[PDB]
Symmetry: C3
Subunit: 419 residues, 3 copies
Amino acid sequence: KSINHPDIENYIAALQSDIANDLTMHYFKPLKNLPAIIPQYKTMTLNGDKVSNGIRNSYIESHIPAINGLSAGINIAMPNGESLFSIIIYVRRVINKASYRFLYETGPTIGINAKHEEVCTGKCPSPIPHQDGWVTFSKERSSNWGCEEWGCLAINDGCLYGSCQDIIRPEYKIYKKSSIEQKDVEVCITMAHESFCSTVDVLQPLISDRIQLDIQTIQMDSMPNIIAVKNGKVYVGDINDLGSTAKKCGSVQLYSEGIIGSGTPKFDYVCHAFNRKDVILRRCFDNSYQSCLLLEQDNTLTIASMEVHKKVSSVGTINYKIMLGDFDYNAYSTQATVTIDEIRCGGCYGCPEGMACALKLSTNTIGSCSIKSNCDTYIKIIAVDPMQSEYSIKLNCPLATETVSVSVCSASAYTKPSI
Amino acid sequence: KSINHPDIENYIAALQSDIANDLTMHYFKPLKNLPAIIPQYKTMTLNGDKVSNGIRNSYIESHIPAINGLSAGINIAMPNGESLFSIIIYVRRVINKASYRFLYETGPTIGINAKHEEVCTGKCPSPIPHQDGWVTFSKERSSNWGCEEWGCLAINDGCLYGSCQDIIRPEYKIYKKSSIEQKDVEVCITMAHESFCSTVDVLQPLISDRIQLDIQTIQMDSMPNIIAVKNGKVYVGDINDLGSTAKKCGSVQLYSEGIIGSGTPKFDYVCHAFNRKDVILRRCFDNSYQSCLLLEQDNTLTIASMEVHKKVSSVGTINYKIMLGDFDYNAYSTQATVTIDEIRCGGCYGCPEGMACALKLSTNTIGSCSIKSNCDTYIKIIAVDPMQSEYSIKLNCPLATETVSVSVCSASAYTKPSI
Amino acid sequence: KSINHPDIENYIAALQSDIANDLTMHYFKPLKNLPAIIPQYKTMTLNGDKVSNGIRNSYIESHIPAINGLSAGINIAMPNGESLFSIIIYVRRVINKASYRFLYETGPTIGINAKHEEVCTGKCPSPIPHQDGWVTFSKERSSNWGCEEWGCLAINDGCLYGSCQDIIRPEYKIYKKSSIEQKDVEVCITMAHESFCSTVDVLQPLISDRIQLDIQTIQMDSMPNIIAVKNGKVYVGDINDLGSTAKKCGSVQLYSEGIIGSGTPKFDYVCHAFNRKDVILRRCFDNSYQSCLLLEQDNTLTIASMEVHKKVSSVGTINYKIMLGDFDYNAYSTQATVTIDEIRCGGCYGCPEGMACALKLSTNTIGSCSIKSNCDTYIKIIAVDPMQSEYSIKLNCPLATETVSVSVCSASAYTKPSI
Ligand SMILES: [Cl-]
Ligand SMILES: [Cl-]
Ligand SMILES: [Cl-]
Ligand SMILES: [Cl-]
Ligand SMILES: [Cl-]
Ligand SMILES: [Cl-]
Ligand SMILES: [Cl-]
Ligand SMILES: [Cl-]
Ligand SMILES: [Cl-]
Ligand SMILES: [Cl-]
Ligand SMILES: [Cl-]
Ligand SMILES: [Cl-]
Ligand SMILES: [K+]
Ligand SMILES: [K+]
Ligand SMILES: [K+]
Ligand code: NA
Ligand code: NA
Ligand code: NA
Ligand code: NA
Ligand code: NA
Ligand code: NA
Ligand code: NA
Ligand code: NA
Ligand code: NA
Ligand code: NA
Ligand code: NA
Ligand code: NA
């Protein structure tokens, strides 16, 4: 009837338009057609106000963990009056990430490249001649009766020497962290069928007229210094840096300029009465590739591409304050509806991959859930997503385990492990 | 006289009963007969209210570090009126923990299991025969005049070969972390002779009608990946993972399926004119057990049982809000009364155990104290407990140290180190 | 005219005097003649009050990251009235630090100290005689025709043995962490030409009548366990602990009591018909010093002196509350004016030092800036200081890089790398 006295519909439309325009003018990005976002988180709130002339301007302040997928609800209502609409504070993305650089490939030794010579008289040359990266071997006093090349009559004299380098079958690629790690956090104001989002970092709070948000955090040091990569999966553990040949994964290293390895060749020889000796070479470098096979896959790490991303729980706290005018505000939340539609587990006890479980999950909302098991877990919370159905986790189950149980939010499921 | 006009006694009894019932109905656990809890912590508070009809409903909000043993006091008073009672927010437990799994035992080499054979003619067999886990050794051309088994006349021919594996005396057990680490935090509402407690984690704030609490935190990565255990004590440092034989602690590994070691045996032999050669074996594997002796004990780690617990300082912040009705609220605290009843220190400078001190402490309260020394310390704060009298700490004191001084809260003590 | 009705000048002087006296009486330290401090940080604020009789006493509460150099502004104004003065909350210092202790020196092998003997008859002695820390070598059956010392006629008998220890040229000094690490945080109340400062730690908030501050934090584990030091610079990576001789940096260790190394000497000998054999010794220990050359310098670490300091981003949150009486309060900030006056970069891609850049920066304020680059960086924020003009950073630039770009706060600069 009148713009003086608006009905509830146009009053709410006006308020949401005002918020949207404020956020957009302060560089929040509008996102549309997002999946369902039904807030799980509610904590205490602080409510306050100031009056200008005779008009009360009230606010609500609260905070939410900087946890991927988590959101909190605020209901907006007329003073001592009816509910109008909801504002959701939604932590749309939390990940840690760092750059990595390629160091070398490794794998088992499958052959030896070798060179050798012998001399009838004189002592072994100093040094033993060799290519860079090749290790040497030699024996003095190699000329003797019954053990002569053709035409040599020297006794307890001469030399047999050479050099060698392993040949490997490449199986793992090894990378080193080549940046500081950093948090990547995006937070959204979610209103009915529209969201307004922005990355947030610790030096620059998000400021609009009605809504302010900031992250409080602490520098993290969560990501591994060296990793090994096989078949798109990230392994961590006892891994040599480039140039180190300690007896652990990656003691033989194939990279752009050649191969690196060390060790004392297993070198001997067999005699002939009037022919060159045969070199018996049973090992060149030491190679501890079997250590690579025992590296543990870290399911929290994924290759983004080099760039690695780590799934993490909380990276801090998002504070927020909402001041719309003369309103009442209250927090709300709802437990998510999650079902574990299926669960398959296979693996073993004390093993590198432990007990690997594939879950199919249904959820009515983007959110974050507690994950529990009768086994030990390698995450405490898992982000759930209507647009993703398949989730995988790694478990550490005792040898005395006949059923694996897993719960996500309030959902439970069990399976007998697939051996 | 009247339930309309209650005296102070029954008014306070009613309010504390109302709180207790609220907390219990919202799944807080009632604890009784706890030791003295006299709060040490006070910071700024936020005070606020709303009136419904004509009744004011006021609150106080504040926060306290998630630190084991720490507590904060809130005094409840009539508006512009007398004090009624106190509510204490008490951080009853903070620890980090993770599961571990057994990898192997190690210790010094005390003998060699060995096998050997010789052949009169021919070259060394390929491969040298051996059991799994045994390393091999061989020498070609072992038959010669003056150096023959009975009936052999071969010259610069034949072979002497064998295999070996160390025997160790087990001294340390080595474990690997086999779960994510997690915080274990319990917080209590402490009123006169009754406490109401609950574990708290980051996804689920503690909600009752009158009192809300939450923890804000960040994922931690505080606990070691590999440890060595001797006599109930946890050591950390240069420790091989299972299957790695780098020259550091644990290069020889005794586990369920056998022993793991590597190296080039120190193998030679002595001749007889018409009898088998004697094998001289001065070393089989390399063994770097002396590195285990230099591992540092980490006094913050304890075996719970595998499960390890770590003592830590802050793991985050506990926020809390209290809204009882029409009251005034103010924070309070009191310095703890701590005495160092005795102190004994023994050790040395640059040593694995450093300077080890046993303290006997008295305290009038569960609490958390700053610990200081003229030496370097391995903790900055220590939890104090009326039910525990003995405390031990590790110090790093310079060679130029003749008296060790230590303070805990306001208490001081000194001793000459016991060498 | 009257002390009843003060002008604005003496009213502001009175209020600032009252604050200064309060802070000083509560053990804040007065600092004078500090560089310009113009606050960059503003987030949401909470405003509140209580009236006593008829006098309103109002407050403002907010928080600021515990970040070195950062500050936040609060403007103090008459109620519905004019601005009076400003209070700045200034995080004057944030660093992490720990003590370290000297382990050993290492560098390349440049010679071998050796001893040897031979015997005409008998087998090699058990053990081979040697000094502590020397490795042994021996060969049985060393006496033969054509290969005898003067007067020996033994055949396939006798022994040649000895011991050896590397000589190195010292290049790096290796230290181990010998304390817990700790935060060192100082915060100031900054008013016109005077600041009031105090260290703050998590157990003890800073309390005065008008202003309270606290730090909320979490235990950090940011600093390396072992480091290598060369020319005042700190290197981190694959570094042996004292007594460990794995094939990585520091496998040969010179310390107070001697040298530590391990390995199988490359030992052989040459014959004479009637003179002692010549010992050919081509290597004693294994030495993996070339690994030290590939260690990465960590520019966030500096030697304070042993004591090491680490530059870090946020270590937590500083909360603060200001209550002066009947005032209005509002937050404010200003973007810093920073210029990159020059930038020089030199280095290479995949290299230990990466791409090293020296910057000359101008700034109108102590502050904290975001640092960005087209290359990868090893810090995300950098503290800027009017009293410091030279800043250096390390970059990880791809082989496909022809111009290095760097921004600090809003300033940008680029250079072609100096190769
Ligand atoms: Cl050589
Ligand atoms: Cl940070
Ligand atoms: Cl190693
Ligand atoms: Cl997982
Ligand atoms: Cl073989
Ligand atoms: Cl002969
Ligand atoms: Cl967390
Ligand atoms: Cl090694
Ligand atoms: Cl300790
Ligand atoms: Cl020996
Ligand atoms: Cl802490
Ligand atoms: Cl840097
Ligand atoms: K002959
Ligand atoms: K003969
Ligand atoms: K002869
Ligand atoms: Na912008
Ligand atoms: Na709702
Ligand atoms: Na012959
Ligand atoms: Na010929
Ligand atoms: Na429950
Ligand atoms: Na009291
Ligand atoms: Na004979
Ligand atoms: Na016989
Ligand atoms: Na004092
Ligand atoms: Na101003
Ligand atoms: Na001769
Ligand atoms: Na002579």
